[model samples]
Target: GVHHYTIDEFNYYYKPDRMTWHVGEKVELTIDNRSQSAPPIAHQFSIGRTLVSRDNGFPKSQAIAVGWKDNFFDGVPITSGGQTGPVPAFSVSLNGGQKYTFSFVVPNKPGKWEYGCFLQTGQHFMNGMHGILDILPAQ
Candidate 1:
């Protein structure tokens, strides 16, 4: 099943959230920046092994310790117009009205993993974009 999500500035405030899945499960996360927000918001959804980051950057430790890396989601901008391509599967930023569907396995490790928007890592996360990706053992 696909889980749904949202992202935007609270104009300055925020709310916490959560989700669940199972180990080895391929879950499709559908994120929306539907412009239902105050500012030009973007979301970089990443599933890490830890529930933390130091600032707008991953502390290297938690940065690389993930089954999925959004940085790998970046691209070469197509030269046609869009700034996204082949190696880095992720973009540095995104705007409203944009949509993305990331289908990834829940990792072999079970428990709560850190699923956060590290765009403004320290802030977005601390403000609430940071949440738990609760992974359970397959029954």
Candidate 2:
């Protein structure tokens, strides 16, 4: 059996919360954007170390931005009032009520990965649009 996960902007952060799975297993992610106000909010899904940028010149890179171009998904570019668009690598997109599905083969490497939205409008992330995904060692 494969692990299934869902991401809802309003309910679950822009990204799913605490996504954990075993290496060598199949994982399916279903992302649903329920924002009814068009210009579908853009989001990102990455698998890597999570970091926080510093202003004290500590030279620390925050959450290496990966996956998707600039992590932006426009259901409809420059449009308004709810839209739907597909993500790169993963062929899926969701509108206010629409849904997109994609599958991934977990890497054999055991580690933690984080995914989220990089929107600047009111920091959609600050409002809960990101999360961490963990890959556990195979038994």
Candidate 3:
């Protein structure tokens, strides 16, 4: 089975703060940033058991880091914005008016996961730019 999800990112919040998926499901998610700001803010989407505000010495910088050992996108082939590859480091950032669509097959990790936007030194997340993800067992 497959699951489709979309996230609308505002200045400091994510619409539909809750989401659900089934293990081993094909997942396609699109994130649109409609946040209006003076200097146009960039929001990030990261999911994992725990959230790390800054990257922990990875090959590249991931504003919001995911626990490598339990990362959702780990070992998953993801296609985002027409590009197919691994998530730089478990997080993707989009500027206002920009959008990203990522697709992958959900890993067999069933549990409650956390998603958030830790841009702006974590102020975005602190300001309610966060959400919860529930991965249920396949029926």
Candidate 4:
């Protein structure tokens, strides 16, 4: 099944706070941009394990970074004052007051992940335009 979410001027401060899914299950997500005058916006979604490389010469593995792998959608480009096609899955971009939809199947990995918009200016994220995607282990 697919999930839907909305983005407005007020919620622009931060990305969605919560997301839940089942491991190994295919989950779809859709985002709608509701900013009219804003410039072009791009978003990146990644799911994978986090690997922290240490500077030490000691040969050893680091602690497992908890959360979803870096698996996410490629950056969806949305022109300023223009709308975008239905993105990966059923997702779309809404211009200013316009709206769009996107859809994608969740990875089979049973873990949490992170999703956010990677705008060219980096203002969207810097201003709090990211969110967490949680995928619970399958039964």
Candidate 5:
């Protein structure tokens, strides 16, 4: 079955800041930009499971996305990159007071993930506008 979900961004914060779901289910979600910020300072939503990597010796960055593995899991399934999809879940950027709608099956894998309102070069998210998205195992 598909679940309907909605989230709103207000001033550098995400309302209903936490969510949980099971694998194999489908979900239809809407993200609304209700922030007081304007263009070049907009907000958007994307969910992904990020891991820290330290493979590069003396590398410039330690915990980079590496390949943005779960980048599209919020809107796509199967895989986010390399191969395996007609749609590899991409994030939707929103201008202030705008909204975006999307529907997709819950990813088959279960894990801890996070969603962020990546505005102001992610400064808003780093400073706070983020939420939790837990994907549980299907029984």
Candidate 6:
């Protein structure tokens, strides 16, 4: 089966808080950062065991900004704001008004996958900006 999900992110939360999928299914996912503040904050949608960053001088935190292990999007291609490329996998960053969309086959790892925004050095996720991906067995 194929599933589609659009995750709308605000200052520090994600709507449609939870998601469920089956192993071997195809997933079409879009992440929209809806930060409407004057400065328009940035956010990232990362999934897997650990999250990493490419920014030099980024903070050192096992939970954020480095050491992304088992990234779900590793080696996957994504499209965002008129740009397409196989940049860093595992996560996508977006400022307010920006969005990212991609499609991939769900991995065979059936378990609870945690997705979060590590942009503010994990503060974003620490402040409740995270979601759960429940991957169940194929029907």
Estimate the TM-score for candidate 4: 0.49
Q: Which ten-residue region of model 1 has the weakest summed lDDT?
A: 71-80
Q: What are the per-model C-alpha RMSD values against the true structure? A: 7.9, 8.6, 5.9, 8.8, 6.0, 4.9
lDDT of 4 by residue, 36-134 (tens): 345634443333334222244665443222223243433433222354432343223344444433344444555555554444344454555556667
Model 6: per-residue Cα lDDT over 1-139, one tens digit each: 5578899988888986798988778778888999978889998877776455456566644334443467766665555456665656656789899987777776677888777777766677767787888989988
Q: What's the TM-score of each model vs. the native?
A: 0.55, 0.57, 0.80, 0.49, 0.72, 0.75
* Residue-pair clashes per candidate: 11, 8, 0, 26, 1, 0
Model 2, 21-119: lDDT tens per residue? 787776666777676455555444343454442255456334332233322122212212253334344323344566666565565657766666544
Output the number of the TM-score-best candidate. Answer: 3
Roughly what TM-score does model 1 have, to 2 decimal places? 0.55
Candidate 2 worst ten-residue window by lDDT: 71-80
TM-score computed on alpha carbons, candidate 5: 0.72
Best candidate according to lDDT: 3
For residues 1-139, could you state the per-residue lDDT of candidate 5 as single tens digits?
6688889887777887998888877777888888764442477777766633336566642232222346636446433225444454677678777887666678666777877755454556556777888889987
Least accurate 10 contiguous residues by lDDT in model 3: 60-69
Inter-residue clash pairs, candidate 5: 72-89
**lDDT of each model, Cα atoms only?**
0.48, 0.52, 0.77, 0.43, 0.67, 0.75
- Evaluated against the true structure, the overall lDDT of model 5 is 0.67
Q: Candidate 6, which segments miss by more than 4 Å at Cα?
A: 50-68, 75-88
Ranking by lDDT: 3, 6, 5, 2, 1, 4
